[PDB]
């Protein structure tokens, strides 16, 4: 859809992956 | 009847963007609720290294593209910050996430010429973060629940 949505879409990934390493 | 929440939370930000920018530590106290402030900013300043140059590639590439040039721009990103919580979904790996990319950008507004841009960002990134998600962020004891999920114990258990 609007770019807002693909610039959003990579900053979650890289933030789910990254919750991953932590949360326990 | 002022929002301490914000308060706390733009004081952990906005430092953390702007000595990230400049690359300077802010001698000024943290006051109130400082103990728990201080050791975020502290967790902030470990995670938020990591996140950044782990990510640089990807930071750069967005940054690029954004085209951010004044505080009109630092508005627009809001839009961004929005639809990163838009699935319904908290935690605090997306707000690191979140405000490792605000000091990205906080650096290349310091580079050109544009670090009046610094505080409104910062002000942006804690308005959606404390305003939106308050409920998630009290469920996890505020910023103590921060420390707490990335501290890195070191006991012969």
Redesign the interface.
Same mark, same amino acid.
């Given at each position: 859809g609007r770019p807002?949505?693909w610039? $959003?879409?990579?900053?979650?990934r890289?933030?789910?992956?990254?919750? $991953?390493?932590?949360?326990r | 009847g002022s929002d301490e929440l914000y308060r706390q939370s733009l004081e952990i930000i906005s430092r953390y963007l702007r000595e990230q920018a400049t690359g300077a530590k802010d001698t000024k106290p943290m006051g109130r609720s400082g103990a728990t402030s201080r050791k975020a900013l502290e967790t902030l300043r470990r995670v938020g290294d990591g &996140?950044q140059r782990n +990510?640089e590639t990807?930071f750069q590439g967005?940054l690029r593209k954004?085209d951010i040039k004044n505080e009109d721009d630092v508005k627009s990103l809001s839009? &961004?910050?929005? +639809? &990163?919580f838009?699935?319904g979904?908290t935690?605090?790996?997306?707000? &690191?996430?979140?405000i490792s !990319?605000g000091a990205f950008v906080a650096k290349h507004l310091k580079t050109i010429n544009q670090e009046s841009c610094i505080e409104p960002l910062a002000e942006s990134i804690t308005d959606v973060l404390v305003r939106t998600k308050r409920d998630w962020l009290v469920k996890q004891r505020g910023w103590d629940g921060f420390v707490e !999920? !990335?501290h890195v114990e070191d006991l012969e258990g």
């Open positions: 807002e949505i610039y $959003a879409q990579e900053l979650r890289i933030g789910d992956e990254f919750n $991953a390493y932590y949360a | &996140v +990510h990807a967005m954004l839009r &961004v910050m929005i +639809h &990163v838009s699935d979904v935690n605090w790996g997306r707000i &690191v996430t979140l !990319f !999920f !990335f």
